[PDB]
Design an enzyme around this catalytic site. Structure first.
Site, PDB file in Angstrom:
ATOM      1  N   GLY A  13       0.403  -1.148   0.350  1.00 44.85           N
ATOM      2  CA  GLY A  13       0.077  -0.042  -0.328  1.00 44.85           C
ATOM      3  C   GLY A  13       1.068   1.834   0.074  1.00 44.85           C
ATOM      4  O   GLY A  13       2.386   0.697   0.135  1.00 44.85           O
ATOM      5  N   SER A  14       0.310   2.741   0.117  1.00 47.07           N
ATOM      6  CA  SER A  14       0.777   3.482  -0.199  1.00 47.07           C
ATOM      7  C   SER A  14       0.118   4.961   0.850  1.00 47.07           C
ATOM      8  O   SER A  14      -1.479   5.051  -0.348  1.00 47.07           O
ATOM      9  CB  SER A  14       2.073   3.832  -1.671  1.00 47.07           C
ATOM     10  OG  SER A  14       1.308   4.429  -2.861  1.00 47.07           O
ATOM     11  N   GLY A  15      -0.041   5.507   0.516  1.00 47.08           N
ATOM     12  CA  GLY A  15      -0.562   6.965   1.432  1.00 47.08           C
ATOM     13  C   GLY A  15       0.347   8.272   2.182  1.00 47.08           C
ATOM     14  O   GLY A  15       1.056   8.131   1.729  1.00 47.08           O
ATOM     15  N   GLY A  16      -1.070   8.519   2.542  1.00 46.31           N
ATOM     16  CA  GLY A  16       0.079   9.490   3.721  1.00 46.31           C
ATOM     17  C   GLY A  16       0.671   9.140   4.973  1.00 46.31           C
ATOM     18  O   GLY A  16       1.973   9.885   4.634  1.00 46.31           O
ATOM     19  N   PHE A  17       0.756   7.584   5.154  1.00 43.50           N
ATOM     20  CA  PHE A  17       1.392   6.994   5.061  1.00 43.50           C
ATOM     21  C   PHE A  17       2.880   6.519   4.866  1.00 43.50           C
ATOM     22  O   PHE A  17       3.642   6.095   5.734  1.00 43.50           O
ATOM     23  CB  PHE A  17       1.065   5.451   6.666  1.00 43.50           C
ATOM     24  CG  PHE A  17       0.279   4.877   5.067  1.00 43.50           C
ATOM     25  CD1 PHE A  17      -0.627   5.152   4.397  1.00 43.50           C
ATOM     26  CD2 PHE A  17       1.000   3.694   3.834  1.00 43.50           C
ATOM     27  CE1 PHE A  17      -1.791   4.257   3.234  1.00 43.50           C
ATOM     28  CE2 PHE A  17       0.152   3.074   3.547  1.00 43.50           C
ATOM     29  CZ  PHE A  17      -1.064   3.449   2.638  1.00 43.50           C
ATOM     30  N   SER A  19       4.710   4.799   1.886  1.00 42.75           N
ATOM     31  CA  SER A  19       4.472   3.013   0.343  1.00 42.75           C
ATOM     32  C   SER A  19       4.780   2.066   1.314  1.00 42.75           C
ATOM     33  O   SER A  19       5.611   2.087   2.492  1.00 42.75           O
ATOM     34  CB  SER A  19       5.721   2.779  -0.472  1.00 42.75           C
ATOM     35  OG  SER A  19       5.556   4.563  -0.662  1.00 42.75           O
ATOM     36  N   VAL A  20       3.672   1.437   1.872  1.00 42.31           N
ATOM     37  CA  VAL A  20       4.447  -0.257   2.318  1.00 42.31           C
ATOM     38  C   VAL A  20       4.719  -1.646   1.373  1.00 42.31           C
ATOM     39  O   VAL A  20       3.587  -2.291   0.754  1.00 42.31           O
ATOM     40  CB  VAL A  20       2.982  -0.841   3.550  1.00 42.31           C
ATOM     41  CG1 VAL A  20       3.669  -2.072   4.400  1.00 42.31           C
ATOM     42  CG2 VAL A  20       2.903   0.461   4.191  1.00 42.31           C
ATOM     43  N   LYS A  35       8.599  -0.161   5.767  1.00 48.50           N
ATOM     44  CA  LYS A  35       7.760   1.227   5.460  1.00 48.50           C
ATOM     45  C   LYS A  35       8.412   2.318   4.721  1.00 48.50           C
ATOM     46  O   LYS A  35       9.719   2.362   6.105  1.00 48.50           O
ATOM     47  CB  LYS A  35       6.961   1.339   6.523  1.00 48.50           C
ATOM     48  CG  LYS A  35       5.879   2.452   6.161  1.00 48.50           C
ATOM     49  CD  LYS A  35       4.492   3.226   7.170  1.00 48.50           C
ATOM     50  CE  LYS A  35       4.699   4.443   8.657  1.00 48.50           C
ATOM     51  NZ  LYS A  35       3.596   4.381   8.950  1.00 48.50           N
ATOM     52  N   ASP A 135      -5.760   7.994  16.066  1.00 52.16           N
ATOM     53  CA  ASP A 135      -6.691   7.359  15.413  1.00 52.16           C
ATOM     54  C   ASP A 135      -6.751   6.400  14.557  1.00 52.16           C
ATOM     55  O   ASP A 135      -6.838   5.731  14.099  1.00 52.16           O
ATOM     56  CB  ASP A 135      -5.573   7.785  13.663  1.00 52.16           C
ATOM     57  CG  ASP A 135      -6.456   7.547  12.128  1.00 52.16           C
ATOM     58  OD1 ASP A 135      -5.177   8.073  11.490  1.00 52.16           O
ATOM     59  OD2 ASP A 135      -7.308   8.223  12.171  1.00 52.16           O
TER      60      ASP A 135
HETATM   61  N1  LIG Z   1      -3.692   4.402   6.753  1.00 55.66           N
HETATM   62  C1  LIG Z   1      -3.208   3.043   7.209  1.00 55.66           C
HETATM   63  C2  LIG Z   1      -3.384   1.536   6.710  1.00 55.66           C
HETATM   64  C3  LIG Z   1      -2.688   0.023   6.111  1.00 55.66           C
HETATM   65  C4  LIG Z   1      -1.418   0.922   5.682  1.00 55.66           C
HETATM   66  N2  LIG Z   1      -0.787   1.444   6.506  1.00 55.66           N
HETATM   67  C5  LIG Z   1       0.244   1.151   7.214  1.00 55.66           C
HETATM   68  C6  LIG Z   1       0.513   2.454   7.840  1.00 55.66           C
HETATM   69  N3  LIG Z   1       1.856   1.970   8.751  1.00 55.66           N
HETATM   70  C7  LIG Z   1       1.963   0.210   8.879  1.00 55.66           C
HETATM   71  C8  LIG Z   1       1.753  -0.197   8.560  1.00 55.66           C
HETATM   72  C9  LIG Z   1       1.496  -1.600   8.601  1.00 55.66           C
HETATM   73  N4  LIG Z   1       2.606  -2.296   9.446  1.00 55.66           N
HETATM   74  N5  LIG Z   1       2.676  -4.310   9.019  1.00 55.66           N
HETATM   75  C10 LIG Z   1       1.969  -3.881   8.051  1.00 55.66           C
HETATM   76  C11 LIG Z   1       1.480  -5.665   7.786  1.00 55.66           C
HETATM   77  C12 LIG Z   1       0.395  -5.207   6.492  1.00 55.66           C
HETATM   78  C13 LIG Z   1       0.418  -4.194   5.986  1.00 55.66           C
HETATM   79  C14 LIG Z   1      -1.309  -3.741   5.335  1.00 55.66           C
HETATM   80  C15 LIG Z   1      -2.370  -4.914   4.396  1.00 55.66           C
HETATM   81  F1  LIG Z   1      -2.054  -6.417   5.621  1.00 55.66           F
HETATM   82  C16 LIG Z   1      -3.439  -5.191   4.031  1.00 55.66           C
HETATM   83  C17 LIG Z   1      -3.681  -4.028   2.899  1.00 55.66           C
HETATM   84  C18 LIG Z   1      -2.454  -3.383   2.917  1.00 55.66           C
HETATM   85  C19 LIG Z   1      -1.649  -3.072   4.347  1.00 55.66           C
HETATM   86  F2  LIG Z   1      -0.609  -1.826   4.295  1.00 55.66           F
HETATM   87  C20 LIG Z   1       0.588  -2.801   7.010  1.00 55.66           C
HETATM   88  C21 LIG Z   1       1.464  -2.528   8.079  1.00 55.66           C
HETATM   89  N6  LIG Z   1       0.257   0.281   7.413  1.00 55.66           N
HETATM   90  C22 LIG Z   1      -1.395   2.464   6.773  1.00 55.66           C
END
Ligand SMILES: N[C@H]1CCCN(c2cncc(-c3[nH]nc4ccc(-c5c(F)cccc5F)cc34)n2)C1
EC number: 2.7.11.1
Length: 273
Positions: A13-17, A19-20, A35, A135
């Site tokens: 994913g990616s957004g304000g947070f 890119s993951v 992240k 949040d």
């Molecule tokens: N606005 C939120 C919504 C979700 C993405 N965001 C953040 C922010 N900080 C930490 C993590 C994060 N930490 N560890 C992870 C393992 C999987 C997934 C993960 C998932 F299981 C399914 C879909 C998207 C994903 F990103 C995210 C993970 N994620 C922002």
């Protein structure tokens, strides 16, 4: 180093947070999340005990990452010339509560009771560590589908817990208390309990209760689904317009509707598996 330590997979994913990326620790195939975030996009800075200028998110995370809990933990991080890269846990299989509800529609009360409870326990943890998430929502809560355990995520809006007033808020709006909407002033705990009421409604009804500033400040909760009377009461109690009429965590956990919670493992046997 990083790339040597972790084998980066596909973008999650990616957004304000930021890119993951999906990833795996080479040392033991541990599944992890990587992240990335640019410094230029970092607003809230802070520092570790050793006084390193790092993102506040890292400060907080480190403070709630000791030992077991319902909070995705920060395993390790890395500073780069123009960004910070955090290595976080990664359940598998996993699904966030948003998509879960979006998929399953309003949840059965027994399931919601299980989830909500876990949520509460995790928030009490954060507060113990002196951390205010700021949040709480279905998007920032992951579900470890085989365990039936919920994990909190995204502390990039968090703050150190404090007893005085807060005048800054950069979390989700529709989830913001009326006192912020009207005065731009709020207190940790009580504003937290307001979002916990939005979440509970969200689970049992399948969608948040208020959409406009006018709705949030009027504080009128209409149920689109058939909800128990004990449950509507706990929800309306959390959504009390006056911060001091909202329940305390202990009060929420001692609410009739919250008795006889299922443990995670059974929650999974019964509603997930
Ligand atoms: N606005 C939120 C919504 C979700 C993405 N965001 C953040 C922010 N900080 C930490 C993590 C994060 N930490 N560890 C992870 C393992 C999987 C997934 C993960 C998932 F299981 C399914 C879909 C998207 C994903 F990103 C995210 C993970 N994620 C922002």
């Amino acid at each position: 180093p990083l790339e040597s330590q972790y084998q980066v997979g596909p973008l999650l994913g990616s957004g304000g947070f930021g890119s993951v990326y999906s990833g795996i620790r080479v040392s033991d195939n541990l599944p992890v999340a990587i992240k990335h975030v640019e410094k230029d996009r970092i607003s809230d800075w802070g520092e570790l005990p050793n006084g390193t200028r790092v993102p506040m998110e890292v400060v907080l995370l480190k403070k709630v990452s000791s030992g077991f809990s319902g909070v995705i933990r920060l395993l390790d991080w890395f500073e780069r010339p123009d960004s910070f890269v955090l290595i976080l846990e990664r359940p598998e299989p996993v699904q966030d509560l948003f998509d879960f509800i979006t998929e399953r529609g309003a949840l059965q009360e027994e399931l919601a009771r299980s989830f909500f409870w876990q949520v509460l326990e995790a928030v009490r943890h954060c507060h113990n560590c002196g951390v205010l998430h700021r949040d709480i929502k279905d998007e920032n809560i992951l579900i470890d589908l085989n365990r039936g355990e919920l994990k909190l995520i995204d502390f990039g809006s968090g703050a150190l817990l404090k007893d005085t007033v807060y005048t800054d808020f950069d979390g989700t709006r529709v989830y913001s208390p009326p006192e912020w909407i009207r005065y731009h002033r709020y207190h940790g705990r009580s504003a937290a309990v307001w979002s916990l009421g939005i979440l509970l409604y969200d689970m049992v009804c399948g969608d948040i209760p208020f959409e406009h500033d006018e709705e949030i400040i009027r504080g009128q909760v209409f149920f689109r689904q058939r909800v128990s009377s004990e449950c509507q009461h706990l929800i309306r109690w959390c959504l009390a317009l006056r911060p001091s009429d909202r329940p305390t965590f202990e009060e929420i956990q001692n609410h009739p509707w919250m008795q006889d919670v299922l443990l995670p493992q059974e929650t999974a046997e019964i509603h997930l598996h």
